């Protein structure tokens, strides 16, 4: 079993990184194009990023829910900048309108400059104390309880969400974080622990630690991984596409991004930037794992590059560690959603092996362009 | 010079108040029905309420924006439970996706229990201090400024909204409130001051008060009024429908509703609850002004009742006081939106006079159901 | 079993017949309103009329299919004015796009003036000869057969529809007609025989006649009835609403309508026109069967008028005769669709009994408008 | 000025011709993707093919109209298989539902086998006599006339289209045909004369003939061209992409299509098949004009292949001949719609030079994926 996600580029899209050449603006029509493509191609869901660099995740997810049928939306909540009772009501409303298609990504926010801009002057350990108290109120409120809670940071009295969610006990909690406090938080409250595309050896160590701490609370959590993907029919086309993706990036842009990454107080972000060292050489840190994206883009900075057989093999290596969720992305996000679904889906377990080419449809007849007006293609 | 709004019943709908008989569940489909009706009928916009008793306003409005073309959405924000910078990004995104169809209703929250349920333990004077600092940050960030602010309650450092809104300088701010702190805040920062359906005499005093305080800041504030409406072809049918609206309300529900109203420290709620005092008699506090709605429903608790000429007469009276915005509602909200547009619109100024019956359309030809198969109606 | 249909007023809508007072123009917005209401309220489908007085059924049905989830569309085909091979491809495409939600209403056309306007100069028997040959090509082509056909009226060689339909062997064939040629055609080729709202005794004879002729061919056809419905909470309101429907109808308009009906060459139209005799008196030709609609409207000219228990009883009577399909309509079509579902559905067999009031939804919680802000309705 | 159309692959889509490898089935979701992409990218419209090899044009176009805002639809009508009065009502309905976004492609049918399959046993000259009589009735009824027409093939009495279209006097008539009868028909009745992708010298002779024949009637006929496009950043990429397109085409499939084209009774099809005569070598019949598509595809069988400067240059060569409309297509039709708009639109006249990259968008701010979370791309 495997859940394959796509990605909504709410922070912008294009053919090349760190530039405006071939860039596509974030519009409702284009986001609808990507979401409906992922919905019809059979992706389990789409991840919506959050932060100052992105449009609001909740406005986007809510606008695309009535325009899609089965696609699930992994939406980020940010404790510390919103009341947990209100956030719970937001999740309840969106889960009700979507008929149980809401997934929650718990985000603590690793940029102190962004946090101060939102009015949150908490330290790294305080952000996780807030998130811990946030989730405890959030989870109980969505289970129908009038909550009285008085913590170090948050205090509510008679917190109630009158409209229950569709998913019981609440929309599943996804969480990504690499710090010690992050692993304690995931082990206690979250349902799925997420990691960025570190090499398999590093991901194995992070999974073993989360599984160990989850055993102390008598819990078993699931695991997912966030990776870019540059797959082509051959590996030579894939590496050429990987090279062209960062060819228009000047050293003034690389050094500016790494300088902004040094300001971040995020254990996961530092581990990602440490893979490429801010240089253009040795970007293939592992077989078919390419760290060129991290030179400019924050967060996910690695990509699987190669033919379909190679990309599938690297997906199996991660799956052998206990990873069941895979959140992929490509540039541009519309075309690469079709590319990954056509090249990689037939090599993945069901239902993705059967969803390839056809998609979510039951139609037959002339499959492909008709030869003249009386010859079926073969 | 008139904008006519309708209302999305995100707190529940039905044919009768208090009871569940004839109640209509609020789903995505039914909200699409109401929103698309007001859009096609030519209403300027719809009001979406906020609170523990309602679904989330932002999730609802975002879900209905891609499903309408011209309809504006008056969406409520509540300072004190969400970061002002994050709220500005939410407003920017929705205003961009809707192409400038977003309107903001500033809500301070008049129920101390609901405020404590969300984590806010502020007094009446402190809630307006937070809103005042909230709006100052909110209005400046949406204008492209990197804001440094340090007030009594809020503190931001390098607050920025990277995606500018469509409406300049920002989506217009609507505000309702009758306390002295409310009128000072309305005079300084809001664009439209809203009032509930009080008799014209009391509305004129509140309007004259806000208008004078706003003059000290050099601002010309617009005025709107929130009112229920029960309009029928004759005045006799209207009073029958008003009686049926409350015929299934027991005295134990009235006491439970008024017991909650006394908990509210809201000045506007106190003035509305004092018009009926829980009585079932003397509900016509003014010519064609019926206060039966306020027996169980908080907020707007008065209604215009009568034939189209009587309802339009009360509307012109309010308009002669300087009121340019009108937010109406009826039970059930779908049918009454058509009834009001078909009975009252032809009696209102343009464009509502021309929008009567036809609506926002350019189609010609047979008007009405055809006679036989070749005889046009006349 | 029981399938309950609604009706799309593609020939115009309104509150009153004959006149233009309270008329609603047929627009894409309003047809979306009616279709999406019937879809969400749980109706099995909607009937779309065809003819000179209506917008094209195939364009309307195709435009609303992507905007609805489970609603079926009973679309009309008229042999003699379109190639059966092309019509077969149209049915295949719409059935494929709707994922098997297409239903076919075979219409022979009962107005010689309209038929001549379309280029058809066939007599009554010749129209049924064309229809009989049409359906044979239509059914064989949709079953994947390369058809050579040389009949009296139609001639095709190597007729093929390369895209098969979702429903096998083809979308079901509904047919309405009262002539002897109609009963032969229905007994031999159609799946469901439809009749207008005649008294149960007259319906029983037509049903027995069709059933006997189908037995001779070794076939069993189902039966449905087409009726208007004016249902109110009490019987007195229903009869008052029936009087309002024809209060704005002048005798000059009745005479012009009945003069056009005498031009028609349809047995079913004459049987319907013979129920009211072109007069306003004795319109209740049967218990709760009111023939006032036929005084101006062509086709369905009777209505079920009464309280829910009275309407549900007349439905049960028809169902005792073997009728399993019920195609209802009301004025206006949007509001009356909710009225019938909220009043009659609880008195109908499953699933209409469980779909009553709530529609097709899995939402729980506060049912009805909230009392104050923490008191659930009861 | 210039109108740039795209193409809906209602006959099938994919990456490679002649084979099922990489093929995409014609589904509602995929067609919605292609149409909404062309709508948002700024294309003037899309062409929808008709015939036995495709899904029905009217069903497809009607289903996509409510899902698009500005995109126009060039929909085919085929005289001889449908009544002109019925066809005019379909055009009136779709033009009204789309608010004037309907265009008509007049198709006579060049395949005798496909025509006989639809019940039309007319010769080449007879098909143009039917079309001439069809269009006279079609154009007159849409102008609000009760038409009496008695011709050699068609006879109508009191033909009326009750619902007038939005476009006056009627939706524009596009027409393609290279025979002498076609050029007479285009000079007299049609608004836009279309030609397939012949070399510029052969196009100039056809346009000069039509212009001369139309001047005798005092009419000016707009000119358009239909062409596939394989454009890439470099010329070598485009030529390699063109080779990949036909690399899976078996020589037995080429002969299976050329023998099918010999049966056709179309002068324009013969002129297209005479450009290569099945020869696999030297398919570049003109600078950047590649006839590789004509090996297996009927109708349009030539493509523009080259870098953006070469493709734009060939477009300007056709424009100087007087061609104002361009109907382009590519494989696959979704990805190639973006490729052409992003690569060729900036080299085209307004408004396509402004629609490049930006598209129909008034949004400002970040343009492309954000560098980190505060640095905008440049
Ligand atoms: C898969 C994944 C997705 C994430 N998405 C976001 C996001 O959208 N916005 C964000 O600010 N942080 C995101 N993060 C990062 C964390 O949620 C959080 O901001 C912080 O970096 C965790 O800090 P830590 O590694 O020091 O424990 C994501 C992390 C992962 C692994
Ligand atoms: C037109 C209008 C709409 C309002 N909408 C809301 C709402 O949706 N939620 C809410 O809590 N309060 C709403 N209020 C009430 C005030 O915004 C605020 O909550 C408080 O009651 C004002 O307190 P005050 O009158 O003492 O200054 C509304 C008021 C008006 C006039
Ligand atoms: C339920 C029902 C629906 C019908 N719908 C249509 C229609 O939409 N357009 C139409 O022209 N005739 C319609 N008819 C009438 C017949 O299909 C046909 O046109 C003709 O009147 C039958 O003639 P006959 O009774 O003499 O056999 C309908 C009949 C029934 C019973
Ligand atoms: C741009 C263009 C589009 C056409 N589209 C179609 C079509 O969709 N279906 C079709 O059968 N023929 C199509 N044709 C061909 C003609 O409409 C017609 O079928 C026939 O080939 C003309 O015959 P002629 O060249 O001998 O005058 C098209 C022609 C052109 C130039
Ligand atoms: Na390193």
The 3-state secondary structure of B144-209, one letter per residue: CCCEEEECCCCEEEEECCCCCCCCCCCCCEEEECCCHHHHHHHHHHCCEEEEECCCHHHHHHHHHH
Answer for the pair B122, B80: CB distance below 8 angstroms, yes or no.
yes
Q: Which stretch of DSSP H or E encloses residue A120?
A: none
Phi and psi at residue A95, to the nearest 5°: -70, -30
DSSP label at residue A65: G
Considering only CA atoms, which of C232, C237, C241, C228 is closest in space to residue C198? C228
Q: Using CA coordinates, name the residue in chain D closest to C85.
A: D118
Answer for the pair D171, D102: CB distance below 8 angstroms, yes or no.
yes
CA distance D139 to B125: 72
CA distance A100 to A95: 5
CA distance C300 to C176: 11
CA distance C352 to D347: 60
Considering only CA atoms, which of D230, D203, D226, D219 is closest in space to residue D320? D203
Index of the ligand 4 atom closest to the CA of residue D271:
25
CA distance D156 to D145: 12
Paired with C290 in beta bridges are C284, C303
Cα–Cα–Cα angle for B41, B42, B47, rounded to 5 degrees: 95
C110 is annotated as contributing to ligand binding: no
CA distance D85 to D138: 6
In which domain, by residue range, is A23 found? Answer: 3-354
Paired with B306 in beta bridges are B231
Q: Is the CB of A79 under 6 A from ligand 1?
A: no
Quick count: other Cβ atoms within 10 Å of Cβ C201? 9
CA–CA min distance D159, chain A (Å): 34
User: Which of C365, C366, C368, C371 should one mutate to test binding to chain A, selecting the residue with the greatest count of A CBs within 10 A?
Assistant: C365
Q: How many A from CA of B90 to the centre of ligand 2?
A: 21
For residue A168, with 0-12 CB atoms within 10 Å meaning exposed, 13-18 middle and 19 or more buried, which class applies?
exposed
Q: How many CB pairs under 8 A join A and B?
A: 142
Bridge-based pairing of strands B222-231 and B192-196 is parallel
Compare CB distances from B81 to A55, A83, A163 and report the shortest one's residue. A83
Residue B70 lies in a domain: yes
Numbered residues of chain D with Cβ closer than 8 Å to any chain B Cβ: 96, 99, 160, 162-164, 166, 362-366, 370, 374, 376
Quick count: other Cβ atoms within 10 Å of Cβ B282? 10
Cis peptide before B352 (omega within 30 of 0): no
Structure tokens at B78: 């509540």
Compare CB distances from B257 to C14, C22, C375 and report the shortest one's residue. C375
CA distance A47 to A68: 15
Quick count: other Cβ atoms within 10 Å of Cβ C237? 14
Widest CA span of chain D, in angstroms? 74
CA distance A58 to A67: 15
CA distance A178 to A180: 7
C297 is annotated as contributing to ligand binding: yes
Residue B253 lies in a domain: yes
Considering only CA atoms, which of B269, B262, B107 is closest in space to residue B173? B107
B128 is annotated as contributing to ligand binding: yes
* Nearest bound ligand to the CA of residue A291: 5
Structure tokens at C208: 């027995």
Tokens 């042999």 -> residue: C79
Answer for the pair D71, D91: CB distance below 8 angstroms, yes or no.
no
Q: How many A from CA of A327 to the centre of ligand 5?
A: 24
Rg (C-alpha) for chain A, rounded Å, is 21
Structural domains counted in chain D: 1
C193 is annotated as contributing to ligand binding: no
CA distance C190 to C174: 6
Helix (H, G, I), strand (E, B) or coil at C121: coil
Structure tokens at A89: 């009501």
Quick count: other Cβ atoms within 10 Å of Cβ D277? 9
Cis peptide before D51 (omega within 30 of 0): no
Phi and psi at residue B256, to the nearest 5°: -65, -30
Q: How many A from CA of C127 to the centre of ligand 3?
A: 12
Q: How many A from CA of A111 to the centre of ligand 4?
A: 61
Numbered residues of chain C with Cβ closer than 8 Å to any chain A Cβ: 96, 99, 160, 162-164, 166, 362-366, 370, 374, 376
E strand residue ranges, chain A: 3-7, 13-14, 23-24, 45-47, 72-77, 102-106, 147-150, 155-159, 173-176, 192-196, 222-231, 284-286, 289-290, 303-306, 323-329
* Chain C CB contacts of D67 below 8 Å: 66
DSSP label at residue C293: G
CA distance A84 to B154: 18
**Secondary structure of chain B as H, E, C letters:** CCEEEEECCCCCEECCCCCCCCEECCCHHHHHHHHHHHHHHCCCEEEECCCCCCCCHHHHHHHHHHHCCCCEEEEEECCCCECHHHHHHHHHHHHHHCCCCEEEEECCCCCHHHHHHCCCCCCHHHHHHHHHHHHHHHHHHCCCCCEEEECCCCEEEEECCCCCCCCCCCCCEEEECCCHHHHHHHHHHCCEEEEECCCHHHHHHHHHHHHHHHHHCCCCCEEEEEEEEEECCCHHHHHHHHHHHHCCCCHHHHHHHHHHHHHCCCHHHHHHHCCCCCCCCCCEEECCEECHHHHCCCCCCCEEEECHHHHHHHHHHHHHCCEEEEEEECCCHHHHHHHHHHHCHHHCCCCCCCCCCCCCCCCCCCCCCCECCCECCC
CB-based contacts of D348: which residues, under 8 Å, 6+ apart?
D2, D4, D312, D315
Q: How many A from CA of D107 to the centre of ligand 4?
A: 6
The answer to whether A83 contacts B85, with C-beta atoms less than 8 Å apart, is no
Experimental method: X-ray
CA distance B346 to B363: 19
Ligand 2 site residues, Cβ closer than 6 angstroms: B 49-51, 76, 105, 107-110, 176-179, 182, 194-196, 226, 266-269, 299
CA distance C330 to C341: 12
Q: Which stretch of DSSP H or E encloses residue D275?
A: none
Tokens 């790494």 -> residue: A258
CA distance D32 to D65: 10
Bridge-based pairing of strands A222-231 and A323-329 is parallel
Answer for the pair B30, B24: CB distance below 8 angstroms, yes or no.
yes
Helix (H, G, I), strand (E, B) or coil at C270: helix
Tokens 């008229």 -> residue: C78
DSSP label at residue D4: E
Structure tokens at A140: 């109980």
CA distance A167 to C129: 58
* Chain B CB contacts of C13 below 8 Å: 368-369
CB-based contacts of D85: which residues, under 8 Å, 6+ apart?
C81, C117, C118, C119, D137, D141, D147, D156, D159, D160, D161
Q: What is the CATH number of the domain that holds B85?
A: 3.20.20.30
Answer for the pair D122, D130: CB distance below 8 angstroms, yes or no.
yes
B266 is annotated as contributing to ligand binding: yes
Structure tokens at D66: 């409510």
Residue B377 lies in a domain: no
Length of chain D: 378
DSSP label at residue C179: S
Helix (H, G, I), strand (E, B) or coil at C84: helix
Helix (H, G, I), strand (E, B) or coil at C235: helix
Q: Whose CA is nearest to atom 23 of ligand 3?
A: C266
Considering only CA atoms, which of A198, A174, A160 is closest in space to residue A73? A174
CA dihedral A309, A311, A317, A321 (to 10 degrees): -140
Considering only CA atoms, which of D125, D123, D119 is closest in space to residue D81? D119
Index of the ligand 4 atom closest to the CA of residue D182:
27
Residue B364 lies in a domain: no
Residue A366 lies in a domain: no
Q: Which stretch of DSSP H or E encloses residue C44?
A: none
* Nearest bound ligand to the CA of residue A198: 1
How many Cα atoms are found within 13 Å in the side-chain-facing hemisphere of D301? Answer: 27
CA distance B341 to B358: 10
Tokens 């990873």 -> residue: A323
Residue A43 lies in a domain: yes
CA distance A227 to A323: 12
Answer for the pair B251, B296: CB distance below 8 angstroms, yes or no.
no
CA distance D144 to D164: 7
Q: Is the CB of D122 under 6 A from ligand 4?
A: no
Q: Whose CA is nearest to atom 30 of ligand 4?
A: D176
**Secondary structure of A133-192 as H, E, C letters:** HHHHHHHHHCCCCCEEEECCCCEEEEECCCCCCCCCCCCCEEEECCCHHHHHHHHHCCCE
Chains with at least 3 CB pairs less than 8 angstroms from chain A: B, C, D
Q: Which stretch of DSSP H or E encloses residue D285?
A: strand D284-286
Index of the ligand 2 atom closest to the CA of residue B49:
8
Q: How many A from CA of B268 to the centre of ligand 2?
A: 7
Phi and psi at residue B6, to the nearest 5°: -110, -165
Paired with A228 in beta bridges are A303, A329
Q: Taking the CA atoms of D123, D126, D132 and D134 in sequence, report the sign of the dihedral they define.
A: negative
Q: Is the CB of C109 under 6 A from ligand 3?
A: yes
Q: Tell me the C-alpha to C-alpha distance, in Å, between residue A112 and each of A52, A261, C149.
A: 12, 11, 79
Would you give the distance in Å from CA A137 to the centre of its chain?
A: 24
For residue D205, with 0-12 CB atoms within 10 Å meaning exposed, 13-18 middle and 19 or more buried, which class applies?
exposed
**Which of the listed residues C266, C267, C329 should we mutate to test ligand 3's pocket, taking the one with most ligand atoms within 8 A of CB?**
C266
Considering only CA atoms, which of B16, B335, B30, B328 is closest in space to residue C368? B16
CA–CA min distance C144, chain A (Å): 10
Helix (H, G, I), strand (E, B) or coil at D327: strand
* Chain A CB contacts of B55 below 8 Å: 89, 92-93, 96, 163
B226 is annotated as contributing to ligand binding: yes
CA–CA min distance B76, chain C (Å): 16
Q: Is the CB of A108 under 6 A from ligand 1?
A: yes
Answer for the pair C2, C319: CB distance below 8 angstroms, yes or no.
yes
Tokens 């939600």 -> residue: C101
CA–CA min distance C96, chain A (Å): 7
Phi and psi at residue A254, to the nearest 5°: -60, -50
User: Which of D232, D368, D374 should one mutate to test binding to chain A, selecting the residue with the greatest count of A CBs within 10 A?
Assistant: D368
Structure tokens at A329: 């992305």
C266 is annotated as contributing to ligand binding: yes
For residue B191, with 0-12 CB atoms within 10 Å meaning exposed, 13-18 middle and 19 or more buried, which class applies?
middle
C268 is annotated as contributing to ligand binding: yes
Answer for the pair C37, C69: CB distance below 8 angstroms, yes or no.
no
Quick count: other Cβ atoms within 10 Å of Cβ C233? 15
Q: Whose CA is nearest to atom 9 of ligand 4?
A: D50
Answer for the pair D42, C46: CB distance below 8 angstroms, yes or no.
no
Compare CB distances from D56 to C90, C113, C160 and report the shortest one's residue. C90
CA–CA min distance A104, chain C (Å): 20
Cis peptide before B332 (omega within 30 of 0): yes
Compare CB distances from C369 to B13, B33, B357 and report the shortest one's residue. B13
CA distance A29 to D39: 9
Q: Tell me the C-alpha to C-alpha distance, in Å, between residue D262 and each of B82, D52, D202.
A: 72, 17, 21
Structure tokens at B207: 């309007």
Considering only CA atoms, which of C333, C326, C278 is closest in space to residue C301? C278
Q: How many A from CA of C147 to the centre of ligand 4?
A: 25
CB-based contacts of D74: which residues, under 8 Å, 6+ apart?
D5, D45, D46, D47, D48, D103, D104, D105, D174, D327
Compare CB distances from A23 to D256, D368, D372 and report the shortest one's residue. D368
Q: Is the CB of C194 under 6 A from ligand 3?
A: yes
Chains with at least 3 CB pairs less than 8 angstroms from chain D: A, B, C
Residue C373 lies in a domain: no
Residue A340 lies in a domain: yes
Paired with D196 in beta bridges are D226
Phi and psi at residue A242, to the nearest 5°: -65, -40
């Amino acid at each position: 079993s495997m859940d394959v996600f796509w990605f909504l580029p709410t922070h912008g899209d294009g053919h090349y990184l760190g530039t405006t050449q071939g860039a596509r603006p974030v519009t409702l029509n284009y986001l609808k194009q990507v979401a409906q493509a992922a919905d019809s191609l059979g992706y389990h869901g789409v991840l919506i990023p959050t932060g100052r660099s992105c449009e609001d995740s909740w406005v986007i997810a809510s606008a695309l829910v009535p325009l899609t049928e089965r696609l699930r939306y992994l939406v980020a909540i940010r404790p510390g900048i919103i009341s947990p009772t209100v956030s719970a009501r937001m999740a309840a409303t969106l889960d009700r309108l979507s008929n149980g298609r809401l997934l929650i990504n718990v985000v603590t926010g690793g940029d102190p400059d962004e946090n101060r801009g939102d009015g949150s002057f908490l330290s790294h350990s305080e952000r996780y104390e807030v998130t811990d108290e946030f989730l405890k109120i959030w989870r109980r409120v969505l289970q129908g309880e009038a909550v009285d809670f008085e913590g170090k940071h948050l205090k509510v009295q008679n917190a109630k969400a009158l409209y229950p969610p569709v998913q019981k006990p609440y929309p599943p909690l996804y969480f990504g974080g690499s710090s010690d406090a992050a692993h304690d938080l995931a082990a206690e409250q979250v349902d799925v622990y997420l990691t960025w595309g570190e090499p398999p050896a590093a991901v194995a160590e992070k999974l073993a630690d989360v599984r160990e701490r989850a055993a102390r609370h008598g819990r078993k959590v699931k695991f997912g991984i966030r990776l870019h993907v540059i797959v082509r029919e051959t590996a030579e086309e894939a590496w050429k596409a990987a090279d062209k993706l960062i060819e228009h990036i000047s050293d003034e842009t690389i050094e500016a991004a790494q300088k902004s990454f040094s300001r971040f107080d995020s254990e996961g972000q530092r581990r990602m930037a440490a893979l490429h060292d801010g240089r253009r050489d040795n970007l293939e840190i592992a077989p078919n794992l390419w760290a060129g994206v991290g030179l400019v883009r924050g967060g996910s900075g690695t990509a699987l590059v190669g033919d379909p057989q190679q990309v599938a093999a690297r997906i199996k290596e991660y799956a052998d560690l206990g990873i069941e969720s895979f959140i992929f992305s490509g540039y541009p996000h519309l075309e690469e959603a079709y590319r990954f679904a056509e090249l990689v889906f037939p090599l993945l377990p069901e239902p993705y092996a059967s969803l390839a080419g056809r998609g979510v449809t039951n139609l037959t007849g002339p499959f492909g362009e008709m030869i003249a007006n009386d010859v079926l293609p073969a």
